[PDB]
Amino acid sequence: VLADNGLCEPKTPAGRRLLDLLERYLPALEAESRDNDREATLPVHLFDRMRKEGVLGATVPEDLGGLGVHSLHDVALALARIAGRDAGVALALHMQFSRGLTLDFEWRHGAPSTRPLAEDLLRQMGAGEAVICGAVKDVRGTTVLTYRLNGRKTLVSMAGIATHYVVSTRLEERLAAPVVARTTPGLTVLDNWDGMGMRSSGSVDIVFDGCPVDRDRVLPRGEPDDAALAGQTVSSIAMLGIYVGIAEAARRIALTELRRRGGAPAGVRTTVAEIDARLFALHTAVASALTTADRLADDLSGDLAARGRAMMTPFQYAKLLVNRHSVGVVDDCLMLVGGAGYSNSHPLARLYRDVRAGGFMHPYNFTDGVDYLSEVALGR
Amino acid sequence: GVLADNGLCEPKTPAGRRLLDLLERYLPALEAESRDNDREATLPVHLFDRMRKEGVLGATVPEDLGGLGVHSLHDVALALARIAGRDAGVALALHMQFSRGLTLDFEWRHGAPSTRPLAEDLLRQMGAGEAVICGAVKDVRGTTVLTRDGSYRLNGRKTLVSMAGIATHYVVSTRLEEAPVRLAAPVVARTTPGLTVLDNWDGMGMRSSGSVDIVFDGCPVDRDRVLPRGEPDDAALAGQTVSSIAMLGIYVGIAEAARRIALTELRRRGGAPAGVRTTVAEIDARLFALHTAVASALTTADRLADDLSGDLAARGRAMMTPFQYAKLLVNRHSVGVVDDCLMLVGGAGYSNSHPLARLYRDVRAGGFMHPYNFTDGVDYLSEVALGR
Amino acid sequence: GVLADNGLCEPKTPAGRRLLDLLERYLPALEAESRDNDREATLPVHLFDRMRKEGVLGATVPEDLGGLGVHSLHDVALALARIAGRDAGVALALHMQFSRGLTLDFEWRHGAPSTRPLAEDLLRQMGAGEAVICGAVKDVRGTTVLTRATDGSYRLNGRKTLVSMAGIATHYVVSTRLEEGAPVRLAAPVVARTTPGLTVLDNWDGMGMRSSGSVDIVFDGCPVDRDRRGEPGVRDDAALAGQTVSSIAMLGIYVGIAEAARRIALTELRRRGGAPAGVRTTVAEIDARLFALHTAVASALTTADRLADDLSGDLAARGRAMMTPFQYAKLLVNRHSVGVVDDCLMLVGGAGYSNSHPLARLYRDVRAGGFMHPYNFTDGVDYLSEVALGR
Amino acid sequence: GVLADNGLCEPKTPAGRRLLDLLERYLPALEAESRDNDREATLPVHLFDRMRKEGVLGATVPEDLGGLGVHSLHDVALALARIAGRDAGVALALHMQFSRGLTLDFEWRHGAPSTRPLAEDLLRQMGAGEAVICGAVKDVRGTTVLTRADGSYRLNGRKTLVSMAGIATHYVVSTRLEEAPVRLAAPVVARTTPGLTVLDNWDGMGMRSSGSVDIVFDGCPVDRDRVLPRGEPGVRDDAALAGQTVSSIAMLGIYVGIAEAARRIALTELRRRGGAPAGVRTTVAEIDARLFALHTAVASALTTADRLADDLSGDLAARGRAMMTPFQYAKLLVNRHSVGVVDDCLMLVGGAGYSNSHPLARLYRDVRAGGFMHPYNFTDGVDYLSEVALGR
Numbered sequence A: 001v002l003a004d005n006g007l008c009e010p011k012t013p014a015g016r017r018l019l020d021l022l023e024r025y026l027p028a029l030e031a032e033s034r035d036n037d038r039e040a041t042l043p044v045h046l047f048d049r050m051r052k053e054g055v056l057g058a059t060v061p062e063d064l065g066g067l068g069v070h071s072l073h074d075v076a077l078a079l080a081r082i083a084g085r086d087a088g089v090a091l092a093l094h095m096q097f098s099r100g101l102t103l104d105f106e107w108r109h110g111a112p113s114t115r116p117l118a119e120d121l122l123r124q125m126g127a128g129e130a131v132i133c134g135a136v137k138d139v140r141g142t143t144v145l146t147y148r149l150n151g152r153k154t155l156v157s158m159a160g161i162a163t164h165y166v167v168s169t170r171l172e173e174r175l176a177a178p179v180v181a182r183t184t185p186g187l188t189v190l191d192n193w194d195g196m197g198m199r200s201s202g203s204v205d206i207v208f209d210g211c212p213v214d215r216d217r218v219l220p221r222g223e224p225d226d227a228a229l230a231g232q233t234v235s236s237i238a239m240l241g242i243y244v245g246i247a248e249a250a251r252r253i254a255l256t257e258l259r260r261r262g263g264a265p266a267g268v269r270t271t272v273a274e275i276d277a278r279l280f281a282l283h284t285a286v287a288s289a290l291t292t293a294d295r296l297a298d299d300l301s302g303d304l305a306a307r308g309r310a311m312m313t314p315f316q317y318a319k320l321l322v323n324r325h326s327v328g329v330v331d332d333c334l335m336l337v338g339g340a341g342y343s344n345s346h347p348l349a350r351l352y353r354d355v356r357a358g359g360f361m362h363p364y365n366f367t368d369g370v371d372y373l374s375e376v377a378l379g380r
Numbered sequence B: 001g002v003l004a005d006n007g008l009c010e011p012k013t014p015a016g017r018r019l020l021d022l023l024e025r026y027l028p029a030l031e032a033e034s035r036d037n038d039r040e041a042t043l044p045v046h047l048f049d050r051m052r053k054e055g056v057l058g059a060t061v062p063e064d065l066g067g068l069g070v071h072s073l074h075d076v077a078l079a080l081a082r083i084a085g086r087d088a089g090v091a092l093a094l095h096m097q098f099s100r101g102l103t104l105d106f107e108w109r110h111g112a113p114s115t116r117p118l119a120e121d122l123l124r125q126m127g128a129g130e131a132v133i134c135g136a137v138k139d140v141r142g143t144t145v146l147t148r149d150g151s152y153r154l155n156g157r158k159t160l161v162s163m164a165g166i167a168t169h170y171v172v173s174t175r176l177e178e179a180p181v182r183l184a185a186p187v188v189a190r191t192t193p194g195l196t197v198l199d200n201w202d203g204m205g206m207r208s209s210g211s212v213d214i215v216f217d218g219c220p221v222d223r224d225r226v227l228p229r230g231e232p233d234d235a236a237l238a239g240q241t242v243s244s245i246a247m248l249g250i251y252v253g254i255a256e257a258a259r260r261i262a263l264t265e266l267r268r269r270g271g272a273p274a275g276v277r278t279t280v281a282e283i284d285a286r287l288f289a290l291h292t293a294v295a296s297a298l299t300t301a302d303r304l305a306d307d308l309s310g311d312l313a314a315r316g317r318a319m320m321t322p323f324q325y326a327k328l329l330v331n332r333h334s335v336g337v338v339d340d341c342l343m344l345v346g347g348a349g350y351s352n353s354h355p356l357a358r359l360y361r362d363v364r365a366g367g368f369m370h371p372y373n374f375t376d377g378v379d380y381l382s383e384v385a386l387g388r
Numbered sequence C: 001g002v003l004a005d006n007g008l009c010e011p012k013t014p015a016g017r018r019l020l021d022l023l024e025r026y027l028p029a030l031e032a033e034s035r036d037n038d039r040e041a042t043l044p045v046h047l048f049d050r051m052r053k054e055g056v057l058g059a060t061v062p063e064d065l066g067g068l069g070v071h072s073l074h075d076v077a078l079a080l081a082r083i084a085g086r087d088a089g090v091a092l093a094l095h096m097q098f099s100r101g102l103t104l105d106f107e108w109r110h111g112a113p114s115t116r117p118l119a120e121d122l123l124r125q126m127g128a129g130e131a132v133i134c135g136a137v138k139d140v141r142g143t144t145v146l147t148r149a150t151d152g153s154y155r156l157n158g159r160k161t162l163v164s165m166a167g168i169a170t171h172y173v174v175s176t177r178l179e180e181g182a183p184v185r186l187a188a189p190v191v192a193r194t195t196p197g198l199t200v201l202d203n204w205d206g207m208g209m210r211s212s213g214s215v216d217i218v219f220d221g222c223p224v225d226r227d228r229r230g231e232p233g234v235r236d237d238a239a240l241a242g243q244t245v246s247s248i249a250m251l252g253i254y255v256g257i258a259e260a261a262r263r264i265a266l267t268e269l270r271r272r273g274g275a276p277a278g279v280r281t282t283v284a285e286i287d288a289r290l291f292a293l294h295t296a297v298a299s300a301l302t303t304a305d306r307l308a309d310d311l312s313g314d315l316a317a318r319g320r321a322m323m324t325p326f327q328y329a330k331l332l333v334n335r336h337s338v339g340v341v342d343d344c345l346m347l348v349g350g351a352g353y354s355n356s357h358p359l360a361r362l363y364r365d366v367r368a369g370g371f372m373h374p375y376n377f378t379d380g381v382d383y384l385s386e387v388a389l390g391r
Numbered sequence D: 001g002v003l004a005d006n007g008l009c010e011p012k013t014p015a016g017r018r019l020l021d022l023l024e025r026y027l028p029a030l031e032a033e034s035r036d037n038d039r040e041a042t043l044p045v046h047l048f049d050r051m052r053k054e055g056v057l058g059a060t061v062p063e064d065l066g067g068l069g070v071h072s073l074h075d076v077a078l079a080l081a082r083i084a085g086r087d088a089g090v091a092l093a094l095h096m097q098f099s100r101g102l103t104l105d106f107e108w109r110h111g112a113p114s115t116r117p118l119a120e121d122l123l124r125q126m127g128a129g130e131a132v133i134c135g136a137v138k139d140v141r142g143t144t145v146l147t148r149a150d151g152s153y154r155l156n157g158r159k160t161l162v163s164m165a166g167i168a169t170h171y172v173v174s175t176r177l178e179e180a181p182v183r184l185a186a187p188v189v190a191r192t193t194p195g196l197t198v199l200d201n202w203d204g205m206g207m208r209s210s211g212s213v214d215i216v217f218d219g220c221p222v223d224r225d226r227v228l229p230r231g232e233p234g235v236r237d238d239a240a241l242a243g244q245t246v247s248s249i250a251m252l253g254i255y256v257g258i259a260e261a262a263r264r265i266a267l268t269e270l271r272r273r274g275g276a277p278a279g280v281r282t283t284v285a286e287i288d289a290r291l292f293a294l295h296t297a298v299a300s301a302l303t304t305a306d307r308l309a310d311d312l313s314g315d316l317a318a319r320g321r322a323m324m325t326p327f328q329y330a331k332l333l334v335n336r337h338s339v340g341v342v343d344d345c346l347m348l349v350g351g352a353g354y355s356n357s358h359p360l361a362r363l364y365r366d367v368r369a370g371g372f373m374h375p376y377n378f379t380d381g382v383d384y385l386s387e388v389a390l391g392r
């Protein structure tokens, strides 16, 4: 299902390298796809190959040793290709990819003081040396920096083989994101990921129990604000490519199956057109919103608040559309293929479980999406 | 939960109610073993033994032949909903007993004269707890043939046979070969030589339903043990309804369960964001539609179930048509209710072990079941509307 | 049409069957006039006279007080469905008569001591074919208020809107606030056509239901004698009951409309021969939704009939018990009756887009259900969510 | 409106911008005349006269030939969106001119050698404001034939839903040609040809201002110098999908605009109305989401059409499909969601909008016309799209 202002071909030469680089892992990812789901395990042997070949440095700037992909359009594109084979992997890789871009931004436009830190991190990631995961969602109480760090985060995809965590916290005497090494004392990685889908993503819990952190590794974060919407967009929007990829994958499998099969009954034609029509909408909506985030990513010239809303609002329309239609496309695909797809090991079963992850992801889920977008529309 | 007048809320027959009362003592256990039974994808045998022994598996055996005399598809569907609200897999398995009682009963009272004694025998054994009978219907890897110097040979494979593990007999649909080709349903004992039951069940959901494969490799069958079945007719549609319609109960019960789980969760949080009110209304509206459309189709099937009196082809269409409309609605709205419940609860529901996960997964099974899936349903229903 | 076992298919009561048999002779005429009544947006008086004189408008008056004795919301809805298949705007007007029958009959048997004779009189006149009674419910241009003049007489001031069938009425039950002295209370005064200060406007221009004559009435200092209830902003759930009784049978109208759209499109499709892949899927989805509508509305009507004359339990719960099914049904009907009609029009194609085409009329008529109170979508969501959540 | 980056918000070409500015001056009158034109079902002749005399009916005529050189379907859709926000039937009528500019341009540059001088003539006449050309396409009461004698030409039949036919000076008539084997053709017939009758029978539920009347051709004399060639009947030719796109795709802007109008009216009303009940926030979010979809989806399909409009370099059957396919996904999405959005707006405003003279009533009636327009309605759309997908 081809689209023009679509998520179909890369916009930048850099991004184009990444897709070419990524081409060699597809047959592999596909090949292990089942076991990783069955066991809910991140494919480490594979992540090393890719780290060592400089995939994990994709969004790291040219100068600091990365491939210099600086386009969310292109990141999303790459995640879609992966997601079509293993979406939990895509979900894991996103953490790095986005981390590449969030860091680049701080390096150039952030607090005067924290540019060197960003630079180290970015340069490290470029060397194929750091694997970084933001750890955001607090569980059983909130997570506390006092420097000694105490707390527990949840669903940190890829923490299994991460070398450092960027950790959202409340600093106590306001807000901050200490960068904490894997090898730090009093840090634990839990083996508790039991997702219905996204299982190869290893979204495990992390415990901080009186962990050391030097001020040389603290990035500050405002106070416990519309301009922040921009960062929130930058860090999540390419995840939308994942679900588009899942949808395309379902479609391929079903079209293949239907083609070797018949024959085209009346139910089959209608549903196929329904599927391709949504797929088309998914591509154009997602690409539009990505175009917006990319255009504004590096433009701090205007009013920074309206700049924030300008990035989030489309992101949120797209997410609303994706969370509704990517699930529906997958469902209709499973329907067209039939019972064989119900078997848990079958690729559609995996895609059906995988695709349902998107709707809880923040910002925003359905409830909070409604709040935001109606407020945009109503003023009240 | 959501209330309807001609809904699936209350039993219509006193026999129906006795069953609901009997099933009540098992709900707590089904609920407790729900999770492990899901993880391991294992039928809960002990519980089946308890139910068998205590008389439940003979629920739809007429009171004269030693069963509980539930002759209502409506009340069976209702029973199935309740069970399905704690474990949809076991409901799917118990359906096999319940529908069998009813189809056998039809054969006992309305089938070919030679077939009746055999239907009587099977019914008595079910009522006595000595017969757990499954229908082996779906061919895999070739089709299944019975061949006839008088004596019978059975050769084939069947897939997705719920409860096949603890069954004592199977009723296997086949081609019969020598006349030209006729269809037939022999009753084949679990211990019949050449028969292998296969532990290959790994469904996304319905995992406790034990829907495994059976292989028949030169199995011997008696001439006095064959149930006769036409040839490869709209009058047959009636039978196709009796043996499946009650399953619509399973999904309504699933959606009822999801709705219970979510409301409890929202009542706990005492928010009421503007998305939450809209969804909850829309969920409840759909439940109301499911409840009424499914009961209506059930009521029609019960009314014609014992009425052989006009045109039999017409009678067939008249039972299958409402059945198919309700299935279509259930298959769309069941999943939709469950999805919206899951959305309302949020992330905790995506944990595979969580009850919503298990319902999200279980509820998707209905759309594949025949008669009919979406595509054949459309054909059937458009045919009934266009005459073409 | 489409065949549901507990659908809106056959009547549940003998008086119900009398009504259906009576309505037959008008079906040809309603159909014939349909296109003109629509184009002109004019209630067909000649026809209402026929029907008045032959006993129709007394359908829901009890047998004793000279009526047909129809007591079943099921059977009224059925009847409205039949009418609505030919002219929905007419069905809509008639509902005004039918519901009033039921509401008065309730008041007759169960209102306070003082009210029962007024009910009796009002029913008897309906029975004789002499009273034609309308509810004037919705305010426009401010609210409608009833006050005591300092001379002990009563004053009624305000404006009502969308009053179906008002133009040929002899009586209006007018919803007002009673303002005195005391706190504000609610009153439903009964006011004669000729009460001076009352004007029936000619201002009905709906995109559909054009034949329903839903005009405005001005109440310009209108006299009401000390003779002819509740309190505003006050949760009174037991009252939800009469609100159900007075509106639910309207759902039959939109079912009738969808059945018609279906019949029309199927006729065309058979006429057309070949059945393409989009047609089949659409036909199936149409019939399925039809199936849903028939069973959901029948279900809610059944609940209302079961409880209409049952006042034995907790009356607030009785109220909720009647409204909740009504409102599921209403939500489903307002989505799917519109849907089905659209699809019927899609199947038939360009010819149905011409304004005079019967499908254009049904496309327009069916859009009216969604606005009707109780409840439009937004209050529907508020009500049913409050029911589900407990707050 | 609701904002998308590659949405239908901004023009892409300088001619598109000049077209858009030129249109802002008619927007007030359109709006003022909106209710009358609808009630009476009358095409605003006068307003068309100003627009013709004033350069606008030749917007898509190239500059070299006297017009404004608007080459972009994206920009044409944009213009139609703007107009449709005030009066969709007027937008619908104008599209006859706009699309004719583009299609004639192609024939001028790429039709058969014998076609091009005829094309050039018609474009110059449009640019000069002397010609107003309608496509009379859809048959009613039999099919429409042009028979070739001595070599003279007679045209017999009926056309319908010829929007803007009443102020036309020429028609380009879809016909079967008989003699030589059975060809397809498009004779160019002048207003004042004998035997030609423009009826006044337009009674649409919506698009009431569009003047979509029937025409009757009764033994009409068409000269040999003036017959555009069109290929052959029944013969599947996917290259033809290119043209079929070019002459219809910009219509999609109308329903975007209509939906965007309903949204303006509803929000205004809700914002005036104060509080937000829990149903309102949700409907508002879904309205907005759907409009976001429609903008990006329609804009994508227009872009595709623009990229292929002049590039005839590969397989032309492939080119056609590459054009018709996104078109049809978009039409599918628009025919669904513009209708839904307008429904939901009308739900949000309440009973007032149910009054036939209310603007939302006009939009509700108007927006439903999209679903019937060919290519394709839903069923033909399903056939085409499933065929592209299954290869069968």
Ligand SMILES: Cc1cn([C@H]2C[C@H](O)[C@@H](COP(=O)(O)OP(=O)(O)O)O2)c(=O)[nH]c1=O
Residues within 6 Å of the ligand: A101, A102, A103, A105, A106, A220, A221, A222, A223, A227, A228, A230, A231, A232, A234, A235, A297
């Ligand atoms: C504002 C902005 C932030 N970001 C990133 C930088 C950080 O990694 C992250 C957090 O937002 P940031 O603006 O740095 O937080 P604060 O406002 O509290 O200082 O978002 C972008 O990538 N692009 C942007 O335009």
Ligand SMILES: Cc1cn([C@H]2C[C@H](O)[C@@H](COP(=O)(O)OP(=O)(O)O)O2)c(=O)[nH]c1=O
Residues within 6 Å of the ligand: B102, B103, B104, B106, B107, B110, B111, B228, B229, B230, B235, B236, B237, B238, B239, B240, B242, B243, B305
């Ligand atoms: C016709 C009919 C069949 N059946 C059952 C009996 C069989 O188990 C099954 C298939 O039988 P079928 O060959 O359709 O008809 P018959 O039972 O008369 O040979 O359906 C009913 O329960 N009710 C009915 O009305």
Ligand SMILES: Cc1cn([C@H]2C[C@H](O)[C@@H](COP(=O)(O)OP(=O)(O)O)O2)c(=O)[nH]c1=O
Residues within 6 Å of the ligand: C102, C103, C104, C106, C107, C111, C186, C188, C229, C230, C238, C239, C241, C242, C243, C245, C246, C308
């Ligand atoms: C309570 C109730 C009222 N009604 C009718 C009678 C009246 O016309 C109307 C109002 O009833 P009532 O309970 O008297 O309330 P109020 O006079 O304050 O509006 O509803 C029923 O038909 N059935 C019922 O059970």
Ligand SMILES: Cc1cn([C@H]2C[C@H](O)[C@@H](COP(=O)(O)OP(=O)(O)O)O2)c(=O)[nH]c1=O
Residues within 6 Å of the ligand: D102, D103, D104, D106, D107, D229, D230, D231, D239, D240, D241, D242, D243, D244, D246, D247, D309
């Ligand atoms: C092939 C093609 C045709 N057209 C136009 C020119 C003519 O007005 C019209 C007829 O050309 P043709 O391709 O013969 O048929 P169709 O009407 O099916 O497209 O289509 C284009 O504008 N662009 C194109 O790429």
